[PDB]
Design a protein around this ligand. Sequence first.
Ligand SMILES: CC1(C)OC(c2ccc(S(N)(=O)=O)cc2)=C(c2cccc(F)c2)C1=O
Ligand SMILES: CC1(C)OC(c2ccc(S(N)(=O)=O)cc2)=C(c2cccc(F)c2)C1=O
Ligand SMILES: CC1(C)OC(c2ccc(S(N)(=O)=O)cc2)=C(c2cccc(F)c2)C1=O
Ligand SMILES: [Zn+2]
Length: 257
Amino acid sequence: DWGYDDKNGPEQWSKLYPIANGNNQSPVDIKTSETKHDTSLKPISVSYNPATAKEIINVGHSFHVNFEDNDNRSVLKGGPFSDSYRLFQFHFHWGSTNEHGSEHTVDGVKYSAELHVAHWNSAKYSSLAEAASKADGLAVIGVLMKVGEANPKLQKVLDALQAIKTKGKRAPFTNFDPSTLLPSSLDFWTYPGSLTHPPLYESVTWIICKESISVSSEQLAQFRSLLSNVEGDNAVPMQHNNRPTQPLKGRTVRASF
Ligand SMILES: CC1(C)OC(c2ccc(S(N)(=O)=O)cc2)=C(c2cccc(F)c2)C1=O
Ligand SMILES: CC1(C)OC(c2ccc(S(N)(=O)=O)cc2)=C(c2cccc(F)c2)C1=O
Ligand SMILES: CC1(C)OC(c2ccc(S(N)(=O)=O)cc2)=C(c2cccc(F)c2)C1=O
Ligand SMILES: [Zn+2]
């Protein structure tokens, strides 16, 4: 139903998903003059087991790399968290052009694309499903991506894309540690927010990295070469899937630095 186009995109979401106009919506513009340093913030600690990598799948508006959810082999802790959060997938957002495709912005600056590494609170909840709509249910690391030099760490992901050309296509995807996609500095901002597309639950603690990572124009072109349609239908390229930033509505963005 929803999407990113002229008829079903972000401007239209609040019709079926009224929380689109909520007070903890994501993404946001991080104004660095207005962030608050939090000395009680601990360093971010991620520990992912490459063996938890399971599959890669075209979900129509995007593609996802899913991880096995059985145990806490791959976890995120530290930062603002009391609980350990279990990794369950990562994915990207990008734009119609190579220069304008991220979701979060920093001091009004839009980046080329964005990496999201999603986790759920398995310490407190029974399942991803139970956590999905709890204020403290999900944790997502966002990394801003800036077009420039090719990023060698993306290669395994990119090579898999030809195996998931149309909506619903899935392929095995194993032995990969997405922490290798993270920048060297783990300075970060954090703020309370939401999924950046429907159902838009305000269930997400966001961790946004201070440093960007690279991506080349040719690599972004591989993202856009995916199709949003089901095989057999007319081809619709997966051209863009980033949401505009949303008002902070009183929220405070905390900085670890
Ligand atoms: C909108 C609705 C019902 O939700 C999902 C979906 C939910 C959660 C996650 S995830 N990986 O947990 O974030 C990913 C996808 C799909 C979906 C799943 C596989 C292939 C596909 F083409 C679509 C849907 O059709
Ligand atoms: C299977 C999986 C991952 O789980 C949930 C989900 C489960 C339970 C609850 S809750 N907290 O019980 O209301 C909330 C969400 C969805 C889901 C995805 C898109 C739209 C939607 F409405 C639900 C999924 O695709
Ligand atoms: C609640 C639960 C498990 O989480 C997500 C989800 C996670 C992270 C982000 S994001 N872009 O990082 O904020 C956005 C959405 C979905 C989901 C729903 C519909 C389609 C889909 F592909 C995924 C879910 O069903
Ligand atoms: Zn995302």
